[PDB]
Amino acid sequence: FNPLYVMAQSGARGNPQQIRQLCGLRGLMQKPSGETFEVPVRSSFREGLTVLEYFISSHGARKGGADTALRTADSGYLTRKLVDVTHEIVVREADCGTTNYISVPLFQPDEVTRSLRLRKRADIEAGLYGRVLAREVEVLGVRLEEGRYLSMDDVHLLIKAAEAGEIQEVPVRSPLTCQTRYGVCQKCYGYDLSMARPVSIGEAVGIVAAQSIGEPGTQLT
Amino acid sequence: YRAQGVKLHDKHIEIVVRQMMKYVEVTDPGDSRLLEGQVLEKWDVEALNERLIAEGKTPVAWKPLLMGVTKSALSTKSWLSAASFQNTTHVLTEAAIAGKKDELIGLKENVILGRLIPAGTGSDFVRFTQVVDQKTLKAIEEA
Amino acid sequence: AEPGIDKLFGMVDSKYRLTVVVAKRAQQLLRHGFKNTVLEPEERPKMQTLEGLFDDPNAVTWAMKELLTGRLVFGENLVPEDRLQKEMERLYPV
Amino acid sequence: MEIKRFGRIREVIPLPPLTEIQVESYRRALQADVPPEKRENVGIQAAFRETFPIEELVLDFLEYRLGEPPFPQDECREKDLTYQAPLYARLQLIHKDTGLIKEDEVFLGHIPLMTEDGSFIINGADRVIVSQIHRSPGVYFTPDPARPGRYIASIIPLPKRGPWIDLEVEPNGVVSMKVNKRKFPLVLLLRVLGYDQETLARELGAYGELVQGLMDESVFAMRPEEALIRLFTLLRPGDPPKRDKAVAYVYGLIADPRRYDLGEAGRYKAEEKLGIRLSGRTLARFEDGEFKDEVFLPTLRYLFALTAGVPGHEVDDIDHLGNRRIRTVGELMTDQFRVGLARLARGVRERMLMGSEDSLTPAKLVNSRPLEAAIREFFSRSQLSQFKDETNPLSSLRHKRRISALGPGGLTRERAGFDVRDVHRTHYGRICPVETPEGANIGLITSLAAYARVDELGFIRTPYRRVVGGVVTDEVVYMTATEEDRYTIAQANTPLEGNRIAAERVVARRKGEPVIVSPEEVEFMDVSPKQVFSVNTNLIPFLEHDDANRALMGSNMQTQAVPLIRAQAPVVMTGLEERVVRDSLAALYAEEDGEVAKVDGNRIVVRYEDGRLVEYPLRRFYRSNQGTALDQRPRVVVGQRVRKGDLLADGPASENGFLALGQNVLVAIMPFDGYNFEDAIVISEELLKRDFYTSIHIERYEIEARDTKLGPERITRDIPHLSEAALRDLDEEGVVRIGAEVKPGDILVGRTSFKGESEPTPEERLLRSIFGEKARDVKDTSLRVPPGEGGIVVRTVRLRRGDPGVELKPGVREVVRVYVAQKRKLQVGDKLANRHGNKGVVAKILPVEDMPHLPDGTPVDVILNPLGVPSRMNLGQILETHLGLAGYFLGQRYISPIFDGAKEPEIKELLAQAFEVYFGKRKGEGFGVDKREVEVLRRAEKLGLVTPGKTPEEQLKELFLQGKVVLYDGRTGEPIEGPIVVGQMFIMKLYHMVEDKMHARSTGPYSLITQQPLGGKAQFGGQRFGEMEVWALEAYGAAHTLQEMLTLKSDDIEGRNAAYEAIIKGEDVPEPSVPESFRVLVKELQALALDVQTLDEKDNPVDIFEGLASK
Amino acid sequence: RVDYSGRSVIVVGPQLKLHQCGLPKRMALELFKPFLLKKMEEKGIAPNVKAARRMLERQRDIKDEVWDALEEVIHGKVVLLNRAPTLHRLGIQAFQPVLVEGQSIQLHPLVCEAFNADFDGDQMAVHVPLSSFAQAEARIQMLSAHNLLSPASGEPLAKPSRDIILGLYY
Amino acid sequence: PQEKNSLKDLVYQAFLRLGMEKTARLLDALKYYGFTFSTTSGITIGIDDAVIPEEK
Amino acid sequence: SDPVRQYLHEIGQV
Amino acid sequence: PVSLETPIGDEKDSFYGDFIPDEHLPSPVDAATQSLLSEELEKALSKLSEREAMVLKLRKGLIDGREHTLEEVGAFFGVTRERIRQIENKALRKLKYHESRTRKLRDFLD
Amino acid sequence: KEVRKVRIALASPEKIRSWSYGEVEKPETINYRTLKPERDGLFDERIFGPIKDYE
DNA sequence: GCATCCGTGAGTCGAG
DNA sequence: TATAATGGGAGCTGTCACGGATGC
Ligand SMILES: [Mg+2]
Ligand SMILES: [Zn+2]
Structure with a gap:
């Protein structure tokens, strides 16, 4: 029930590394050149550092700061680019009627083992969730019709099937293959991820895509 | 994004990438007016070609063209958009020589004109929807 | 949230169509002074003052409330604009 | 209160005068106190000398002198005058072969003076000239990035004094020199300098294969005369190489000490690097008939010796603080002096021809304007010349020790990448690692370390103590960053018995890198930990416990602390807080031992030993650049005996001579109903009750009356169509009366303007007719109090044309200034911080009875959410809070120095002693453990906080030693389930207050060309709905909202007018029309010869100018 | 730059419902001014609009019935809150405002994340959607x-x- | 024990099942109680709360 | 470029 | 004169002209007022007969923007100039009555 | 009529003179004393328009 | 076909 | 409205990475 431990575990605040710096040792620091010092800071923030340790740490602090300062503009610029490319793209109709589609793999070939291993949960969820089915799919005695927007549950089901070797990949409608002019169609786009339902025709999909891709920009290290 | 612990739907990245692939390079005009090596939108060539082949003419041979978000952005049909985004003088001179007309398809164009945008409550789909109470309804039903 | 928002989204093929219907209806209410309303006296949206409860001045609140009832009809090309405006001016003069 | 200081580290020397970097620099630059014949050739004296003599008649410089200021500082600030001294120059005009000399002392205008504390007054407003860091001139060698094998030799002079030159080996093997972006073979220049193939062959031959890449037959044939002209033709085309021109150009490029000035520091760097002796700061010399080389051959020798690896030849770091120097105010100002001077000389030469050739006095020959304007330019529109930041004494003291990469002859920020920003190992004891701006400027702006000094050459030096044998001398050597790299330097905290090193193994640095060493190998040792950090950083106690990233914010924010009417020094101090009040002149002190004669709110009269009676006026309620009140208050009483250096008065934000930025409040670290959510802070109404965090502020309002072509602007109490209610507080002349309380809308100074050309509308005529009244001649232009502003009128000033001593800018009849004061209580939205980087806005002011409180009924002052600590890793605030508790009960304050201070054991002991007071009294007063304290103790031992089975008192003490107490929720009376951290924390009220920042607008001022609303609160203008905000509306698919933003709410004129009128009449807003800025775009494109036409769906043109622009 | 846009410091509003924000009285007086004038005319607070505006011009001339009227003016209405950088569309959100004394804007704790807002001095900008259409868009589409x-991600x-x-886990 | 993830999932599921208007209500509820409890729970930080393992 | 240079040259032609 | 493009601040973000208001084009408020005035003058000219309203409209230039001599208004109505003078004066007098009674145009005192 | 398109093209000297309400023959701007716009200069009313409406 | 030149970009809002 | 006078003068350097054209 320790306050640090609790705040971390709950996800209220804090993470393991920070807790480490508070309680255990501070760790190794890096010179400005990028290569790390031979002696680590042994002190914790509880114990307090030595002026030498402290100064040693300042290099990293600063490097990080400047990094963030620059990445910020890099990301900003990126976002503006993306917005400029995607802006005209809007949901302009319910069905472009295309027969085409894209095939989302549940298995990624592992090069370390030269074998095949199931994709991670979140990866697959990101590939499948709220997508309309391009083709009918039957796994574990459940029929998933064409035109069916996959619920998070639907996706979990499909994963479980893929664990029973029932299905290796899923056919799905997608903007890549959509044949709507000057935009996209409801079916090819899928869920308005914000409402967990079919996207309403007229939603500005491009701008949303740009904002979505770019907003985390400053977080990528 | 995954490495950085960021949940982001493939959908969006796909939306952008599709715009990266929006263009093609011409390998043979066949019997078309277009000339070899010249870039244009996959849409436009698919349409033209269907006109040719369906009219009994030789089709145009085209090659897929990948180009980054910036170049693609500057290559958009709308000159208001392109001239807004970057390379204003270039875009504008190349546009003015050609005497381009902007059809106001995109958000940017309309924002610039102060127009009501083609998305949301401005979408032609829902834009014209009417509301009338039953009373007035039957009332006009007489004709 | 707005009351019955989920139902309202239920009513339409596109959320933006909901928004349009609501906005237009509100414009109607304002134009004809609320006297064209499909709400009955006990359904009339109310507002707290120092004096007491008076009709809610907010036409959009009204509009959505009305929409919930189903007393309202919406869609495209229901009636020519002339006929609409004029029949309404006959039924509820300004 | 008793003051206990921790730590055994002894400071062998105190901190240098903190503003000496400014003060000493300018002092040396002016040399005003030095007698003209005793002056060294530096600063102003150097400039004059470099400019003169003015050749062809010959005008020569003898000496110069500085007068006294025409007005005192206070006079200057009041009148909007620069504080300056008159500069005169004694010049003698000499006719050569004509014998005659005509000598005169000409007036060159005024030169701004630096004040006692290191600032300037320029046009009535205080300014600081920030020191500028840059690459030291010299000769450096940096590895070519394209080829690993080949290095590049760079020759860099002082900025604005000659072009940089680059020497490279080349792929082919021929040496190349780059000057002004043109490369040519170095051998040509070598020849021009009188070098012969032989002379070179013996010199550079030792390094094989390179010399042959040097040798070119044709050039060797030519000699200097042939080769000089060849070179000249390489340097510029299409210009005749008349030999005198070639000599003039190459001389002006290299040998001319006037056009090409290496650093004196540059000179030294060259000498030390290449092991040579320069006869001057020039690259080459003209002696007798021929060019003579100095720098080139040695740098070429070094370059070659480097390319082929030769022991003893180094590559240059170029971010090493040995190769980067500081240009202080003296150097910068002097630079501009030299420029304006060179221009003045240009004018002299120009007038040495036209006009009377025979009758010229030096007065006739010389024009000041170039000089006056060069100096005025530097002090007035320069980037390094900044509005002085004096929010509080520390603000300015720090502003002065600021170091900037940025500025003329400086990095642009596209220039600035990671290398420059970084904290270099040589910043140790020179530049502070912590204190730097947050964001875009990170690494560029920085602060000087506490013990650091900038030397004559502009290199930053740091003190160390000599260690010979095992003994540590008290002798301090100030070292440059380069010299420092020679020695093994022990850490200050290394244990000592006497002057002897007490440890078998000590921590030392060899060239910045840490290593464990024997006392035998220790050459020097740090003076103190303080030396590693800035003055601001040195004010953070427990700094060793704070993560650097937050310490940074602590430092930076102390600069933002507002001076409070009841200000206190922190209960925990680092021990620098007194000397800061000292070195920044805020507090007033006694000159010599003496006795206080008189003591008033306005002045203090002291009789010294000398018998002489000195009177000290006190600054009272004077406004600062930031609007915070600067006033001093007497800290002594009549007949009191005071020694030399004793405190006579307190500055703004000091307490008995100790720096007082905030207040010490009783704080509890616990969440509170989400009101301290995400850094927000919860405050006790008791704080306002006792006027904690209340601060005085003065705003200055100004208005002018001018001569219109339509008539005079009159400042009068007579304003057309105004009630007596409106004019009530206005005196006879129209100016609000001192003492009057003014609110938004109120008139500060009445003023009438003459109405312009009047086109009375027919409506105006019918109306005017109906009421029988006549339209007045004058409009009402009186100055009113802006929205959200106001207070008490503390001052007025009035200046009229043609009254004694006053002259106003042409056309200006009169100028009035109203000073309005306000006493600001702490409120919701206001910003508080501590020295550890904890900062937050006040979200809730709770009535005392809701405040968590101790069993004895004492309520807490502030409630800080603990969630703020773990992520931030700033533990200093925690220890500060604990020791703050102990102090709270023991009635004492502490000094806990950085990196040598109170360790937690000692804090625990003090805590125990405090507990005895806390609980002991209670026991004596006849009370036992409360029923609730038992429950809390239960849950506590469930938390492993106390030892089970021990007594309630023993356990409560066990918690107190951990800094925790039983806390009662004021709402319920029930306790907080766990024991909670309570203690005294030092917290400041920062300069950011909602009062300043709150703003809103319906409609207002629009812009000339665009017709879009103006920006900024002061212009009363709309907020920028930018590209990104638009994107946001687009994504929501909120069309009509967006369209409003783009039309009705901005630059659609018809639209915004119609909207306003409709909303006024309770009608729905109209359809938006075309935005005026699109019309602006169309016309701006037409001006560009491009035809832009809006079209039908039928392609027929559409006229958006509505016929107005078409014939 | 737009009309009817204000700015102030943000401060946490633990007590408000997800669809609300704290909007300082004075700010509201300015932002909705025209409306407040019309209303001031409907109730007899002023002879007409031109008079009402003068009444609001001097701060000392402001009676309490003015405030009461303002409460009537903003009823049902929402305003847009925006923090910069506006990285995604959630950088602007609509809230029905609750007039409060004091000078800072109160923001709901649950929306801070989408705004990347916090309370170390963050400042937000307010915007008034004007038309029935704009207000509709705001309340239906942009409401928090x-x-x-x-x-x-749809998460x-x-x-x-x-x-x-911290509480729930506890 | 309820924490970041669990609660997120709760919210999502409620959004799917109950619907948004209810989910809003649930969010205000979680907010209210969460705060209320957080304050009385007696969470705090003293220096002693950074616990150095004997293993260090 | 540098029109001054060019013109000076054209002048030096006569 | 000084440049509207004179930079404000060490950042290239703002120009001097950016802080210069537009004193020419009427404010939405001013415009509003100027229309309200027309509507109120018209509302006040309805209490007059069309002739005694038209005499004032004509002589103060509310129409065509020109003021007519009493003689010309007399010619337009067919009355003697002195007649038009007296019906103009009685018109204006009735206007003043309506005003002292109703308190409408007062706020346009400015 | 409603605007559905925006064309941009080169202008011929003919078209440029078409737009033009007059030629600027003088580098003058505003009269030094009166401050009224100079005749045939950059700010003329005869060319660009009246400074005051309907006057 | 690769070297190298010129030209164009490089977050937002705020205050000032 | 006339002695003769005849080719300028300053510069500003510590980014970085791209597309596209131009030249070797
Ligand atoms: Mg923040
Ligand atoms: Zn599709």
């Missing part, structure tokens, strides 16, 4: 309570963080 899931954006987790 109607956007609870990220458009990026909840409005969720317990910090203090809420």
Whole structure:
């Protein structure tokens, strides 16, 4: 029930590394050149550092700061680019009627083992969730019709099937293959991820895509 | 994004990438007016070609063209958009020589004109929807 | 949230169509002074003052409330604009 | 209160005068106190000398002198005058072969003076000239990035004094020199300098294969005369190489000490690097008939010796603080002096021809304007010349020790990448690692370390103590960053018995890198930990416990602390807080031992030993650049005996001579109903009750009356169509009366303007007719109090044309200034911080009875959410809070120095002693453990906080030693389930207050060309709905909202007018029309010869100018 | 730059419902001024609009019935809050405002994440949607309570963080 | 024990099942109680709360 | 470029 | 004169002209007022007969923007100039009555 | 009529003179004393328009 | 076909 | 409205990475 431990575990605040710096040792620091010092800071923030340790740490602090300062503009610029490319793209109709589609793999070939291993949960969820089915799919005695927007549950089901070797990949409608002019169609786009339902025709999909891709920009290290 | 612990739907990245692939390079005009090596939108060539082949003419041979978000952005049909985004003088001179007309398809164009945008409550789909109470309804039903 | 928002989204093929219907209806209410309303006296949206409860001045609140009832009809090309405006001016003069 | 200081580290020397970097620099630059014949050739004296003599008649410089200021500082600030001294120059005009000399002392205008504390007054407003860091001139060698094998030799002079030159080996093997972006073979220049193939062959031959890449037959044939002209033709085309021109150009490029000035520091760097002796700061010399080389051959020798690896030849770091120097105010100002001077000389030469050739006095020959304007330019529109930041004494003291990469002859920020920003190992004891701006400027702006000094050459030096044998001398050597790299330097905290090193193994640095060493190998040792950090950083106690990233914010924010009417020094101090009040002149002190004669709110009269009676006026309620009140208050009483250096008065934000930025409040670290959510802070109404965090502020309002072509602007109490209610507080002349309380809308100074050309509308005529009244001649232009502003009128000033001593800018009849004061209580939205980087806005002011409180009924002052600590890793605030508790009960304050201070054991002991007071009294007063304290103790031992089975008192003490107490929720009376951290924390009220920042607008001022609303609160203008905000509306698919933003709410004129009128009449807003800025775009494109036409769906043109622009 | 746009410091509003914000009286007086004039005319607070505006011009001339009228003016209406950088569409959200004394804007704890807002001095800008259409768009499409899931992933954006987790977990 | 993830999932599921208007209500509830409890729970930080393992 | 240079040259032609 | 493009701040973000208001084009408020005035003058000219309203409209230039001599208004109505003078004066007098009674145009005192 | 398109093209000297309400023959701007716009200069009313409406 | 030149970009809002 | 006078003068350097054209 320790306050640090609790705040971390709950996800209220804090993470393991920070807790480490508070309680255990501070760790190794890096010179400005990028290569790390031979002696680590042994002190914790509880114990307090030595002026030498402290100064040693300042290099990293600063490097990080400047990094963030620059990445910020890099990301900003990126976002503006993306917005400029995607802006005209809007949901302009319910069905472009295309027969085409894209095939989302549940298995990624592992090069370390030269074998095949199931994709991670979140990866697959990101590939499948709220997508309309391009083709009918039957796994574990459940029929998933064409035109069916996959619920998070639907996706979990499909994963479980893929664990029973029932299905290796899923056919799905997608903007890549959509044949709507000057935009996209409801079916090819899928869920308005914000409402967990079919996207309403007229939603500005491009701008949303740009904002979505770019907003985390400053977080990528 | 995954490495950085960021949940982001493939959908969006796909939306952008599709715009990266929006263009093609011409390998043979066949019997078309277009000339070899010249870039244009996959849409436009698919349409033209269907006109040719369906009219009994030789089709145009085209090659897929990948180009980054910036170049693609500057290559958009709308000159208001392109001239807004970057390379204003270039875009504008190349546009003015050609005497381009902007059809106001995109958000940017309309924002610039102060127009009501083609998305949301401005979408032609829902834009014209009417509301009338039953009373007035039957009332006009007489004709 | 707005009351019955989920139902309202239920009513339409596109959320933006909901928004349009609501906005237009509100414009109607304002134009004809609320006297064209499909709400009955006990359904009339109310507002707290120092004096007491008076009709809610907010036409959009009204509009959505009305929409919930189903007393309202919406869609495209229901009636020519002339006929609409004029029949309404006959039924509820300004 | 008793003051206990921790730590055994002894400071062998105190901190240098903190503003000496400014003060000493300018002092040396002016040399005003030095007698003209005793002056060294530096600063102003150097400039004059470099400019003169003015050749062809010959005008020569003898000496110069500085007068006294025409007005005192206070006079200057009041009148909007620069504080300056008159500069005169004694010049003698000499006719050569004509014998005659005509000598005169000409007036060159005024030169701004630096004040006692290191600032300037320029046009009535205080300014600081920030020191500028840059690459030291010299000769450096940096590895070519394209080829690993080949290095590049760079020759860099002082900025604005000659072009940089680059020497490279080349792929082919021929040496190349780059000057002004043109490369040519170095051998040509070598020849021009009188070098012969032989002379070179013996010199550079030792390094094989390179010399042959040097040798070119044709050039060797030519000699200097042939080769000089060849070179000249390489340097510029299409210009005749008349030999005198070639000599003039190459001389002006290299040998001319006037056009090409290496650093004196540059000179030294060259000498030390290449092991040579320069006869001057020039690259080459003209002696007798021929060019003579100095720098080139040695740098070429070094370059070659480097390319082929030769022991003893180094590559240059170029971010090493040995190769980067500081240009202080003296150097910068002097630079501009030299420029304006060179221009003045240009004018002299120009007038040495036209006009009377025979009758010229030096007065006739010389024009000041170039000089006056060069100096005025530097002090007035320069980037390094900044509005002085004096929010509080520390603000300015720090502003002065600021170091900037940025500025003329400086990095642009596209220039600035990671290398420059970084904290270099040589910043140790020179530049502070912590204190730097947050964001875009990170690494560029920085602060000087506490013990650091900038030397004559502009290199930053740091003190160390000599260690010979095992003994540590008290002798301090100030070292440059380069010299420092020679020695093994022990850490200050290394244990000592006497002057002897007490440890078998000590921590030392060899060239910045840490290593464990024997006392035998220790050459020097740090003076103190303080030396590693800035003055601001040195004010953070427990700094060793704070993560650097937050310490940074602590430092930076102390600069933002507002001076409070009841200000206190922190209960925990680092021990620098007194000397800061000292070195920044805020507090007033006694000159010599003496006795206080008189003591008033306005002045203090002291009789010294000398018998002489000195009177000290006190600054009272004077406004600062930031609007915070600067006033001093007497800290002594009549007949009191005071020694030399004793405190006579307190500055703004000091307490008995100790720096007082905030207040010490009783704080509890616990969440509170989400009101301290995400850094927000919860405050006790008791704080306002006792006027904690209340601060005085003065705003200055100004208005002018001018001569219109339509008539005079009159400042009068007579304003057309105004009630007596409106004019009530206005005196006879129209100016609000001192003492009057003014609110938004109120008139500060009445003023009438003459109405312009009047086109009375027919409506105006019918109306005017109906009421029988006549339209007045004058409009009402009186100055009113802006929205959200106001207070008490503390001052007025009035200046009229043609009254004694006053002259106003042409056309200006009169100028009035109203000073309005306000006493600001702490409120919701206001910003508080501590020295550890904890900062937050006040979200809730709770009535005392809701405040968590101790069993004895004492309520807490502030409630800080603990969630703020773990992520931030700033533990200093925690220890500060604990020791703050102990102090709270023991009635004492502490000094806990950085990196040598109170360790937690000692804090625990003090805590125990405090507990005895806390609980002991209670026991004596006849009370036992409360029923609730038992429950809390239960849950506590469930938390492993106390030892089970021990007594309630023993356990409560066990918690107190951990800094925790039983806390009662004021709402319920029930306790907080766990024991909670309570203690005294030092917290400041920062300069950011909602009062300043709150703003809103319906409609207002629009812009000339665009017709879009103006920006900024002061212009009363709309907020920028930018590209990104638009994107946001687009994504929501909120069309009509967006369209409003783009039309009705901005630059659609018809639209915004119609909207306003409709909303006024309770009608729905109209359809938006075309935005005026699109019309602006169309016309701006037409001006560009491009035809832009809006079209039908039928392609027929559409006229958006509505016929107005078409014939 | 737009009309009817203000700015102030933000401060946490633990007590408000997800669809609300604290909007300082004075700010509201300015932002909705025209409306407040018309209303001031409907009630007899002033002879007409031109008079009303003068009454609002001098701060000391402002009676309490003015405030009461203002409460009537903003009824049902929402305003847009925006923090910069506006990285995604959730950088602007609509809230029905609750007039408060004091000078800072009160923001709901659950929306801070989407705004990347916090309370170390963050400042936000307010905007008044004018038309029935704009107000409709705001209340239906942009209302905070109607956007609870990220458009990026569809994962909840409005969720317990910090203090809420600390209590619930406890 | 309820924490970041669990609660997120709760919210999402409620959004799917109950619907948004209710989910809003649930969010205000979680907010209210969460705060209320957080304050009385007696969470705090003293220096002693950074616990150095004997293993260090 | 540098029109001054060019013109000076054209002048030096006569 | 000084440049509207004179930079404000060490950042290239703002120009001097950016802080210069537009004193020419009427404010939405001013415009509003100027229309309200027309509507109120018209509302006040309805209490007059069309002739005694038209005499004032004509002589103060509310129409065509020109003021007519009493003689010309007399010619337009067919009355003697002195007649038009007296019906103009009685018109204006009735206007003043309506005003002292109703308190409408007062706020346009400015 | 409603605007559905925006064309941009080169202008011929003919078209440029078409737009033009007059030629600027003088580098003058505003009269030094009166401050009224100079005749045939950059700010002329005869060319660009009246400074005051309907006057 | 690769070297190298010129030209164009490089977050937002705020205050000032 | 006339002695003769005849080719300028300053510069500003510590980014970085791209597309596209131009030249070797
Ligand atoms: Mg913040
Ligand atoms: Zn599709």
